């Protein structure tokens, strides 16, 4: 059987030799009578320079001597059959020795490697083998057309950007992610997207699809992340989780970062990890429980906080369980079924702040379009100095913590039986020093009151907002 | 048997193709080097200038030539870094003022950089970075190369031509009797980890002399820089009206 | 005492009674301090965290203030 | 920056600038107004855009001067 196996290899060698002869013949025919210098001189002479076809071909290309410069057309070959243009290419320089392969920066072979030449201290994600595709609609269980998992290559790209301090540029289109590992930022970084950049997350391979974070940020002091749209179309998982596993995110700035249809959009669950963080022009929309969820410590746990925290022109809209979401069941790519709801009495709110200090909510919006079940628009507990400057608040559909709907008919009953419940207003304040609200326009509030004060909130101050909007 | 017959025919065909390639390459007397240039590593056959000083000494036959500069300083390969400060240059016949960056002048000619996206890096002017020291009191970085004159040339080019100036991570060391001046509107963008370290030893009044002076910088933007001195001497950034008002200057992460 | 690269010595202090503050504002108008922090971590000798003299309309919105070590 | 037009920034219909943001912008030396926002005229259906944010923006020197009136 060995002879029959090696016959095919011999035929492959034959075909390779014949194709080589064909390329040399093509070159000589195209050259014609004219000399090499004349050919180079022709306005299209740059085509007579050889180039590597793909990153794997570069991994196989053995350099005669260290210090050679070569050109790579694209990371993958075959772009011309497809109607698209090459991407991921560049210039590489050879070195003799050993180095750890990367898939991006460094292409390693036995006893040699090639290093990419980076311009302007910046690079793109295609340089690491990532692919994009057309953006799916925001409907419930809808996946993109073609499913290539970008998790490990995007993780390598983040590692290079943190390690060498290059800026990472991202293109329009969706990057699809379906992996059991969470995507981690572990150091200061610059990420810059385009209008249209999307990160689509599929939770089918996660060990705990309901609670496992898609993306994790820690230690990112002085970073800047902009113009990204994360969504998952599942009502499962955390969108972006901030931790202290590496350190504090001491002055991290987010701009135009959108997080949609997760279970929680932005999540924080431990103290001293968002000191001085800034959100500019961000959005959290259509998540299942909350758009923003901050909770430094739970009840009975040691006290702690993070301070200050700044929001500028941020809007939270549509967060909370709708009737469709309550009845929905997610179908995984392994043909499993996961019930979206926890119990039939689930309620949420647009934003939830616990255990913080010196918080400012400037401008922006908090609304309940689409009629989710909410106890409030904002809930504030155990904070010191929460201040609201001119924030648009509108369209709440009122429920108690129990799940009981708050209508006109039972309004008096609610006031008697749910006095100590943390619910029943557009803004619920509980045990908060130094609370303040100026005079925004509020309307369409289907709840018992517009503001609720409880649990020793003792030096508050209330400006003149639009009166007579609640029940 | 049957497999062996085809396996031997494969050898015969391969040898015949080898002879055919030999013959055509020998027949192509003056065009055989095009076969060399068309190989996947053919771009290495093109020559390039090794450093900016070599570029100053390169005499152009005619105006309008294009050349490649590998790096600003040679010797990166002996060390364990990558080339930096390179680019593409175009020759001109005449006289121009040498810059150290934009223009490399010789006797009776000069070379000018091709700038892309209206932006350039400070390495293009010969600036060097090193490892960032800790914030302890009298602690200096490990390598002491003074960037003041080269960074002032870069600032002048960015103000004059309205290019954006890009800075890499690492520390730039500054130890000179002159103060670094920004004299008009400018865009400056650093990276997380860009540091400017100032040694006040050569200043005439170390206790009160400014490290950076900014004046006349209307509508400019400066971002993501970390200045420190570890000395408790000097002014860090001095805002002035020696050229004009800084009417809408924006500083972000400085 | 700072030691220079020419082996000179410079006394860091001006007088043995030196005091400072975090921010000093004099002769300005329409100043807004939005958010941020002013704090004396590390126990420097401060007369105040912020000193404001001869200004028209200085406004502070929610700034974090903490940890001062008081001196005249 | 927008200078020496009749209006610098013009909006003349509802629901088209929801959540817009101006940072460090300028409107200077226009003939009538620097910023002109008007969702609806008189006798028209009510409408609005909301919210709207200006941050360190300047309107300076707009309006008809004597030279402009005679020009």
Author numbering:
A (entry chain B): 152 to 622
B (entry chain A): 155 to 408
C (entry chain A): 480 to 551
D (entry chain C): 409 to 479
Excerpt from the publication:
In the present study, Klebsiella phage GH-K3-derived depolymerase Depo32 (encoded by gene gp32) was identified to exhibit high efficiency in specifically degrading the CPSs of K2 serotype K. pneumoniae. Phage depolymerases specifically recognize the glycosidic bonds on the host surface and randomly degrade them to release the repeating units (oligosaccharides) of the glycopolymers; thus, the phage particles can move closer to the cell surface and bind to host receptors. Here, GH-K3 gp32 was identified to encode a depolymerase, Depo32, which efficiently degrades the CPSs of K. pneumoniae K7 (K2 capsular type). In summary, Depo32 effectively binds and cleaves the CPSs of K2 capsular type K. pneumoniae via the putative active center constituted by Glu545/Glu423 and Asp546/Glu423 and initiates the hydrolysis process, causing the pathogens to become sensitive to elimination by the host immune system and thus achieving protective effects.
